[PDB]
Symmetry: D2
Subunit: 174 residues, 4 copies
């Protein structure tokens, strides 16, 4: 009944965030409570110098603890997740994702870096003890037609996202 | 209702196999179809020369097709899964694990190679399109009291196996 | 002064092998000891059942011992190196690549799996203690004009092979 | 003749930085010019919001371009490099490490995460086009006796660092 959507892009507007926006609306439609976070919710110095007393982190940690699921989105930066997202994940307590379903989403400039999700991001989410990690959705930039005014995807990206979200919603029932 | 267990060790008796035998004892007490396979059930020339016509391969793929879950165990060889296991995995169809929940297990000579499960094995299981990959269990060789005569594990390893199997069991029901 | 080239494809003729044949043509014009091996040079039962007494294994290990560099090529299977190649790699001694410079090459059905080289193959070569691992070359199947009758590559792939081999050549001299 | 040492830890004093300090002194002794950077050299907001016009980044980019080699150190955070270090690496231009020798160093709370170097950090350094990546040195925290007042390591850590640094220095000669 409660889901956190987390945007890992440092820019605004963000292509990977449009996937999260589409996800939010589907989940709202199914009467799931969705709480959206992004890196602007945190003081940069708190993130970079890994300062655990951050008030926003406290709120975020508390909200995560109460969430049944997490949807996390990232750009591919240098064949991995964004450093910006990792600075926040690094501040989460050990076992932060224990008992939780996790759906990872990424967008990349080249399809050449599709494996960044499986080989880089999933291992960090598992280190946080995610109970289940879903297959995820990678899309290269050309598959997101609009991320500035209204999330618009090619039909194949939209179908893969629909499939992922259905699987995630079914998972939230245990 | 149906589960495949797959041992990936080239040798026998095997530590990683004794892990699967323990899983089966726990599932045999729950009215389940458990189908067990090892690398011995296939011809070495079929596996090394990637022969798709292989008769055991056909049997295995059909059984896998109708199964709802997979538990697969490997030794850690050169900081990854065994080459032997991978020759079989390479022969499965592109989407062989689609819609199935997967539980990876491994044994390793040193705790220093614990991450072989998250960074090497899981991306291959994801390439096969696993719907959900569970956290899994790594056991280092210090934890296997006996694997020749029957599974005997130190208490820390048993609790972790027990926990993973509960999750696997619960995950199978949807 | 001495180099091992190692083909990791279970099949022949092979795309990834045609890459190694091109390397050898370039090194044959530089007064070099080049020693070439493939998975056919070993018995399938030895490799699948991890037999350390293997007679070809012994020959290979000695030759590898005195060699200054290694060029190894693999197809991409299930988002990683071939299982077939890995069965041989699993049989080498713990520090087999110590003090040697290594050049990894791969071929893949899609550019989407380019990262299999950095995330899957290189950590195994590092487990074998390679002194230096070079950047390497991934070639997708679109770039191999012919591999049956002789190596024929699109110009983009040839320039990249040429560059990697220059680095490998230069690296061998210390 | 010019080397950049880069500290990826967000804290001060840093255990992984003591390795870099030991490296600096060895290299100074061999009349190499060593330029040390850490994350405090950058405004946090420039790092987090990936702002390429950062004056410090300009200076850092220019110094890196002129360097023959790079030594980069990181703590293991969540089974990978630090996010803080990744935010800086993310701001480097494509091909930033082309033509350069790279020695990666890491310290981790548990030996269980030794593979974080091979499987997480090296692929990012390769994405930046490093010409050669050395084996590297991982050490769990217990091997660094002092990082507050004077870098002091166990004899085995000190020997592995000496070996790595010799290899790096030899490499700087091409
Ligand atoms: C600093 C930076 C580094 C990037 N590195 C990569 C890369 O290594 N591989 C890739 O496929 N795309 C790379 N890109 C492109 C982004 O992944 C891509 O444009 C993405 O959709 C941006 O998502 P966002 O708008 O949510 O930030 C990079 C972009 C930036 C700004
Ligand atoms: C494969 C690829 C890799 C990239 N790597 C970087 C990078 O490393 N650093 C950077 O500033 N931009 C990088 N870019 C550029 C960004 O993607 C840039 O923000 C984008 O091209 C501008 O278009 P956009 O705003 O619509 O995403 C990369 C782009 C691609 C396609
Ligand atoms: C060829 C070979 C290579 C191995 N390499 C590693 C290794 O890289 N890392 C590790 O932790 N253990 C390594 N080991 C130890 C095995 O992973 C360990 O003994 C494991 O329990 C074997 O399980 P099994 O009995 O099911 O074969 C290796 C063992 C063999 C036989
Ligand atoms: C069993 C098998 C599995 C494969 N899986 C992948 C894959 O996961 N990703 C990919 O890019 N290509 C995959 N391919 C395509 C091969 O990587 C590609 O055709 C390669 O060039 C084979 O090289 P070879 O001729 O040396 O065997 C696969 C091919 C086979 C035969
Ligand atoms: C936020 C945070 C996360 C950490 N996560 C891990 C971890 O996943 N694995 C590990 O082995 N150590 C972990 N550690 C311990 C550090 O890797 C270790 O103490 C390291 O030596 C610190 O290096 P530094 O002093 O250079 O920052 C973590 C430490 C912190 C502060
Ligand atoms: C394996 C391991 C994992 C750790 N993971 C975290 C973490 O995720 N978050 C955190 O704040 N601290 C983590 N720590 C604690 C830090 O390492 C902490 O800074 C340290 O225990 C304090 O001692 P030190 O300052 O001498 O390194 C971890 C420690 C270890 C040993």
């Amino acid at each position: 009944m409660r889901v956190i959507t987390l945007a890992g892009s440092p820019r605004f507007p963000s292509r990977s965030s449009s996937l999260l926006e589409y996800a939010r609306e589907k989940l709202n439609g199914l009467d799931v409570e969705v709480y959206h976070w992004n890196l602007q919710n945190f003081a940069p110095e708190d993130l970079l110098y890994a300062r655990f007393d951050s008030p926003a982190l406290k709120t975020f940690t508390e909200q995560l603890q109460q969430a049944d699921g997490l949807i996390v989105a990232t750009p591919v930066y240098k064949a991995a997740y964004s450093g910006a997202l990792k600075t926040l994940l690094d501040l989460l307590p050990e076992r932060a994702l224990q008992g939780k379903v996790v759906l990872p989403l990424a967008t990349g400039g080249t399809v050449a870096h599709l494996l960044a999700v499986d080989y880089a991001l999933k291992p960090v989410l598992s280190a946080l003890k995610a109970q289940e990690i879903l297959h995820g959705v990678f899309a290269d930039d050309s598959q997101v037609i609009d991320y500035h005014h209204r999330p618009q995807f090619t039909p194949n990206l939209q179908t893969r996202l629909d499939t992922a979200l259905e699987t995630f919603w079914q998972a939230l029932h245990r």
